[PDB]
Amino acid sequence: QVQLVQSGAEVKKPGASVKVSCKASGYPFTSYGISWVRQAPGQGLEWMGWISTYNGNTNYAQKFQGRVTMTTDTSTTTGYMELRRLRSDDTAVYYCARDYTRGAWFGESLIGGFDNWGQGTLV
Amino acid sequence: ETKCTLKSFTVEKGIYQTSNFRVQPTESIVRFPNITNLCPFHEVFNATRFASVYAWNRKRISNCVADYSVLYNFAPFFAFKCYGVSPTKLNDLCFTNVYADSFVIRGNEVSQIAPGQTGNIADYNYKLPDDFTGCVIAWNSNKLDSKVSGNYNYLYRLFRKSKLKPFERDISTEIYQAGNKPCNGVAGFNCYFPLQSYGFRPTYGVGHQPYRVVVLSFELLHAPATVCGPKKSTNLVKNKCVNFNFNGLTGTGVLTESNKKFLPFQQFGRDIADTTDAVRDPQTLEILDITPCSFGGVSVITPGTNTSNQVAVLYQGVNCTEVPVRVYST
Amino acid sequence: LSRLDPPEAEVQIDRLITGRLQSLQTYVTQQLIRAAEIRASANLAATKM
Amino acid sequence: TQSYTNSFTRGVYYPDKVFRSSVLHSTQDLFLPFFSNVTWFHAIDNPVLPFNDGVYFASTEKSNIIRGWIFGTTLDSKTQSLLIVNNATNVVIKVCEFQFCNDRVYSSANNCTFEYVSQPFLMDLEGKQGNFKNLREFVFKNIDGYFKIYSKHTPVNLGRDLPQGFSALEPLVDLPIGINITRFQTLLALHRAAYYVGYLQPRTFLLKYNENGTITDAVDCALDPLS
Amino acid sequence: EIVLTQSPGTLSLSPGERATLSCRASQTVSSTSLAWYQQKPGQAPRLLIYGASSRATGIPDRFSGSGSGTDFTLTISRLEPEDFAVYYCQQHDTSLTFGGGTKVEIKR
Ligand SMILES: *[C@@H]1O[C@H](CO[C@@H]2O[C@@H](C)[C@@H](O)[C@@H](O)[C@@H]2O)[C@@H](O[C@@H]2O[C@H](CO)[C@@H](O[C@@H]3O[C@H](CO)[C@@H](O)[C@H](O)[C@@H]3O)[C@H](O)[C@H]2NC(C)=O)[C@H](O)[C@H]1NC(C)=O
Ligand SMILES: *[C@@H]1O[C@H](CO)[C@@H](O)[C@H](O)[C@H]1NC(C)=O
Ligand SMILES: *[C@@H]1O[C@H](CO)[C@@H](O)[C@H](O)[C@H]1NC(C)=O
Ligand SMILES: *[C@@H]1O[C@H](CO)[C@@H](O)[C@H](O)[C@H]1NC(C)=O
Ligand SMILES: *[C@@H]1O[C@H](CO)[C@@H](O)[C@H](O)[C@H]1NC(C)=O
Ligand SMILES: *[C@@H]1O[C@H](CO)[C@@H](O)[C@H](O)[C@H]1NC(C)=O
Ligand SMILES: *[C@@H]1O[C@H](CO)[C@@H](O)[C@H](O)[C@H]1NC(C)=O
Ligand SMILES: *[C@@H]1O[C@H](CO)[C@@H](O)[C@H](O)[C@H]1NC(C)=O
Ligand SMILES: *[C@@H]1O[C@H](CO)[C@@H](O)[C@H](O)[C@H]1NC(C)=O
Numbered sequence: 001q002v003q004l005v006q007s008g009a010e011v012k013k014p015g016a017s018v019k020v021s022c023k024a025s026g027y028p029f030t031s032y033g034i035s036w037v038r039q040a041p042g043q044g045l046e047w048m049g050w051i052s053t054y055n056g057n058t059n060y061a062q063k064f065q066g067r068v069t070m071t072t073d074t075s076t077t078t079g080y081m082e083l084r085r086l087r088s089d090d091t092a093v094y095y096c097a098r099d100y101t102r103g104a105w106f107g108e109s110l111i112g113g114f115d116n117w118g119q120g121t122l123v
Numbered sequence: 124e125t126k127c128t129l130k131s132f133t134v135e136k137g138i139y140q141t142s143n144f145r146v147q148p149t150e151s152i153v154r155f156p157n158i159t160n161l162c163p164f165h166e167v168f169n170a171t172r173f174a175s176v177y178a179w180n181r182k183r184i185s186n187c188v189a190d191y192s193v194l195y196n197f198a199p200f201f202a203f204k205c206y207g208v209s210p211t212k213l214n215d216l217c218f219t220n221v222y223a224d225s226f227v228i229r230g231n232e233v234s235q236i237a238p239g240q241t242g243n244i245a246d247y248n249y250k251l252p253d254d255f256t257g258c259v260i261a262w263n264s265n266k267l268d269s270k271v272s273g274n275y276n277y278l279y280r281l282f283r284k285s286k287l288k289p290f291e292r293d294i295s296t297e298i299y300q301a302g303n304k305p306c307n308g309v310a311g312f313n314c315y316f317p318l319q320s321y322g323f324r325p326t327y328g329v330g331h332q333p334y335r336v337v338v339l340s341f342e343l344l345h346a347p348a349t350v351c352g353p354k355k356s357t358n359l360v361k362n363k364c365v366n367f368n369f370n371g372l373t374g375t376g377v378l379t380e381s382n383k384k385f386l387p388f389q390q391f392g393r394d395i396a397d398t399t400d401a402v403r404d405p406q407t408l409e410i411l412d413i414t415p416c417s418f419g420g421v422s423v424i425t426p427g428t429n430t431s432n433q434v435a436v437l438y439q440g441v442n443c444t445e446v447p448v449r450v451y452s453t
Numbered sequence: 454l455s456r457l458d459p460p461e462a463e464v465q466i467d468r469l470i471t472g473r474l475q476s477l478q479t480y481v482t483q484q485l486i487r488a489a490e491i492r493a494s495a496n497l498a499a500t501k502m
Numbered sequence: 503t504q505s506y507t508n509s510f511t512r513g514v515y516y517p518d519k520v521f522r523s524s525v526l527h528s529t530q531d532l533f534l535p536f537f538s539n540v541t542w543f544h545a546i547d548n549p550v551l552p553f554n555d556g557v558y559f560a561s562t563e564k565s566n567i568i569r570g571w572i573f574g575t576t577l578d579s580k581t582q583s584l585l586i587v588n589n590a591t592n593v594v595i596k597v598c599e600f601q602f603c604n605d606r607v608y609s610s611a612n613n614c615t616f617e618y619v620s621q622p623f624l625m626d627l628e629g630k631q632g633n634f635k636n637l638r639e640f641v642f643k644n645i646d647g648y649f650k651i652y653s654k655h656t657p658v659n660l661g662r663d664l665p666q667g668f669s670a671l672e673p674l675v676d677l678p679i680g681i682n683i684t685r686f687q688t689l690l691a692l693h694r695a696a697y698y699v700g701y702l703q704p705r706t707f708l709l710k711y712n713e714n715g716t717i718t719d720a721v722d723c724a725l726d727p728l729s
Numbered sequence: 730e731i732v733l734t735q736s737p738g739t740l741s742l743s744p745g746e747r748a749t750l751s752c753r754a755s756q757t758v759s760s761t762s763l764a765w766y767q768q769k770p771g772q773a774p775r776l777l778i779y780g781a782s783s784r785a786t787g788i789p790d791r792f793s794g795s796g797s798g799t800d801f802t803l804t805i806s807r808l809e810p811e812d813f814a815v816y817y818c819q820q821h822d823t824s825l826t827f828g829g830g831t832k833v834e835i836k837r
Contacts, residue, residue: 030160030187044817045774045827054160061824095773101821105163106182109171109821111761111780117773171761171821183678209458216456220678266781267761271798345520373455384714385521388673392521401521 002026002116006096009122014088020081020121022096027116029053029077035099035114036070036081040092048094051079054105086123093120125423125434136427144438144448145418146364148375152357153368155217156348156405162189167223168260173268173335175278176226177248177318178294184221186349194258205258206238208341216371217351222340227268227277229321230332233261247280252289257341264335265325273323282317290340345391348405356406364416369402374413381410417446503544507663508537509700513558514707514720515641515652515671523715528708528723532643534558536722540664540700545690550577553686556643556702562635562659562695565626570689571642575682577602579610582681584649586623587689593623597679607689616679623674625655635659635695641671643702647680664698670717731756733820735829741836744810750803752818752828757799762822765794765803768815 007021022034036049050059051070060068072079079096100112124141125134162184174180191213195203203210226249228236235242238253268274282299300306302313310316324331348370359378366375383392383401392401401412419440425433436450454462513534532555553573561568570587577583579601586595587607598614628634634657641652652671659665688697710719722729733754742748760781766774776785781796793804803816813835817828 028159028161031163031165044829047825047827100779101825103163103166105166108166109762110166111169111171111821113764113776113779113819113821114766114774115776115785117775119773171759181680208456209461212456212458266796267759345518371455383521383523386672386715388516388519389521389715390519393525395525 002098004096004098004116004118006118006121011091012086012123014086016086017082017084018086018123020083020094022079022118024077024079024098027098029074031104033099033102033104034070034072034079035097035101036068037095037097037114038090038092039095039120045095049081050099050102052102052104052107057107059102091123093122095120125425133428134425136425136430138422138424138437141421141423143418144421146416146448148364148366148416150360150363150365151368152360152365153354154356154359154404154406155351155354155368156370158186158188158351160185160187162187162221162350164189164194167225167337170225171267173225173227175276176228176244177278177280178292179224179226179249182223182225184223184350188353189221189350190353194260200262201260203258203260207256208258210258214352214354215368216343217348218341219344219346219349220342221350223337224340225335225337227264227321228261228334228336230330230334233334233336236261236336236338243281244279246286247283248287250287250289250291255289255340256343257339259336259338261334261336264333268333268335269323269325271325273321275320275322277321277323278318279321280317281319282315347390359404367413370405372399372402374399376413376415378411378413381412383410383412385410417441417448505542507540507542507698509534509540510664510666511536511668511720512560512639512664513641513671513700513702514668514709514717516673516717519673521715522711524713525711526708527711528706530704530706532556532645532702533705533707534700534702535705536725538700540698543697543699545697546693548687551686551688551699553683554701555704556641557686558639558641558700558702559688560637560639560664560698562637564632564635566624566691567693567696568688568690572600572687572689573642573683573685575684577685577687579612582613584679584681584683585689588622588624591622592619593621594619595677597681618677620675623651623653627657633659637665639669639671641702644683647678649675649677649679651675661695668717668719731758731820731823731826733818733826733829735831737816737831740831740833742808742833744808746808748803748805748808750805750816750818750831751800752802752831753800754820756823758820758822760796760798762820763794763796763801764819764821766817766819766828767812768817769812774817 003025005023007019012018030053033050033052035047035051038046038048047061048064048068049061049070051057051072052059053072053074058070060070067085068081068083070079070081081094096118097114098116100115101110102108103110125139126132128139128141167182191210194213195210208216228244232242232244234240235245236249236251236259237245238251238255240251268277282301283293287293297317298306298308298310298314299317300314304311304313306314323333351370354368361378361380364375364377367373367378381401385392385401385403390403391399394400399413401410403410419438422437422439424435424437425431438448441448457465517529517531559571570585572583572585574583575581577600579599582597583600584595584597585600585608586593588594595616595618596614597616598608599610599612601609603609624638627636636655636657637659639654639656641650643650643652651674653674654669654671656669706723707720708723709717710721712718731754733752735752737750737752740748763781764779765777767777768774777788777792778794779785781801782794784792790807791805791809793806795802795804801818803818813833816831819825819827
């Protein structure tokens, strides 16, 4: 019954800023954080971002410090990436997932994980 | 009824008291507070970093909606033994603050978590008040906190100068001066380390099993209620004998307008007899005046029974015009 | 009644019933002694008048 | 600098948040005893004062002389501390790991997990003259954690020592901090009717309310046989 | 950092018989950090078991997992031919890393 939709697929010139949306419905958008991951053909899946909902805690990965910034709005129940300093080798699909690994209120480790996924955005 | 109160077929001439009359309520209205968030009970129970029993952690719950159905109906492993409230009746109430405490307990020591009890861990590791309220939850963790040769990272104290107060944490690294050896950190004989390890064992049966215990410590204080449950809000009815459930303060009466001057930190209101008389509307911040419905005494005026068979009911305590209130309207 | 199940609620209700009735029984006992004092003085006023 | 002054009648706050009218409710709480010494200082230095069972504080600075307080134990970056230093139009409260001052006021922020921002505690008002140097009264206490601040900003003032009469102390802020505080220190600004301090202890009062619900009078019970 | 050793590279097995998947970590991990995901061609991941063997959604007769302390493996019986997905195993204790690779081919 979960619905997770995103923006469309397009092509961006390197060095620009890509606007990525992720709209959620079917679950209350108050106790589960969002997690942004990247899949490309030829290898597996990466783990850029984790972002809380009740507060504004950031858990960006060590490989994307200072480049990836993430925002969420509960009025439209939608998350936004403004990902700038684009490259030529990072054109890949990006999935937003409802996370269950870290605390959405206090931040401790949990048991479980990405139980709800979107369709992805290809850049 | 005159023949039914005093047991005789013949009733002599006089005036007698039969019973009392009281107008029954006609409608129910529930008005909780305005909120949405869902309470993070899936982060306390479904946690991975439970600490030692001698040094636990203290959590806080803020404004959210807690569904207590998933607590008992879903995942019903062990018995609850809730001390002061019913899990089925838990949905109607709502409270001010909720604290959650988590630690690991030996299998034989499950019963030690009780009001006023004594034991090896009930005095030097965790103490409860005698007036404690709220449920207690325990379940098996034989797969999570267990090692083949045993885990030595979980500690419980054995020796202290005095027993612990309720809800008191006393983490300290020190040696115990016992006997006639003035230990200054030398830690010789009769100078024992008060923290002694668990020493798990997975091949042993019940008695040394890893059980994970979490407790919930509720309270009912007159304050802005913060955590409330899933009941829906309804409308408001003025000048009608109804039932109300304002913030869990149930009762029957008539809700009307008020002319009181409540300060912004004032919510309730008590009369001389220490009873609620004015309740602020949580979703409107207006002032009301709770007054119970009409009531009074009933008396029967009759001549002698063998003389005649006509009566005259005297409805007491009520104005007959405003509240006329079956011999009525004859 | 709003916090306990009926099998346990009758224990706590019985505590309040045997306590409120105790205070009510003390009131009627002290009422009867004092009401007997007034008739000891109403009979004097009946004779004095 | 040190002196002595009779405190007269001061430091009566609302015990709870329950409305009453024409009630003579009596309560046993932590209060300031009637007719007690208060240790008035002067500033122009700066020792460390003990904190026990809450502190009543009152100053009469015109615009801005006192900016915050520092609570906690040992004043070090090993036990958690607290400051109530004001902004221009806000107040910020932190529970953090300050090291020292040596005069920026703090030194470091190691293990700090409470920050709270709100509307400013100290307002200023005058009737186009310096006669109405408004009195600000604060009571700081803690019961099972839950740091509670009770404040009052009264404009009517004459001078010399603390005024007489009855003044209620409304609550503003309750905080869920649950920290261990033992010492007391006051934060001020550099310079180019001040800093009155008194202590609290458990007592029993009988309070007489108004017809509008305001606290009008209070009487002690452990002061005189007449009381 | 912490990585994981991935060598169930090839699964050229018939449908029906015993299936076992083995992936092993670099460093000792807790038993509550275990997850596994499936990759259909051009689809989205979803859980298999959130813990050791605690079921997530349905699990009719095939999916199973067993964690031997640090190590952990996958027990599948009656391998129906249609899924043939890419298998990934994930830890949770230190940061977050994902599985390397596991393929099942159609043996033409
Ligand atoms: C601790 O965690 C378990 C498992 O967590 C589950 O999986 C995670 C990956 C997340 O997606 C969680 O949101 C999810 O709950 C919880 O146990 C599970 O609870 C759910 C919710 O009630 C159960 O679902 C129900 O299943 C019955 C079965 O007939 C249906 O009829 C219902 O309609 C509903 O779908 C589920 O069965 C249950 N057990 C599992 C998955 O094995 C657990 O609740 C949680 N602890 C607390 C205190 O919440
Ligand atoms: C309470 O919330 C309802 C909708 O949930 C809204 O219609 C109403 O105006 C709110 N009342 C307030 C904010 O006082
Ligand atoms: C009713 O009974 C009384 C007592 O015997 C008697 O005096 C009286 O006359 C009776 N009245 C009638 C109407 O029978
Ligand atoms: C009863 O009601 C009538 C009309 O409302 C009023 O005039 C009368 O004074 C009332 N009785 C008393 C005792 O107040
Ligand atoms: C205040 O202290 C001084 C000396 O410390 C003492 O003489 C005086 O009596 C005290 N005040 C009262 C009201 O007791
Ligand atoms: C003080 O207010 C200014 C302007 O609103 C703001 O930029 C600044 O962050 C505030 N500082 C504190 C400590 O609140
Ligand atoms: C407190 O902060 C210091 C410095 O950032 C850090 O080394 C230490 O681990 C922190 N304390 C805890 C309990 O994490
Ligand atoms: C607070 O700190 C003091 C420092 O000496 C200590 O003696 C006391 O036990 C501490 N209290 C608590 C509750 O931690
Ligand atoms: C109480 O409120 C009324 C409302 O006008 C006011 O007239 C009266 O002065 C108030 N009481 C006091 C003691 O100020």
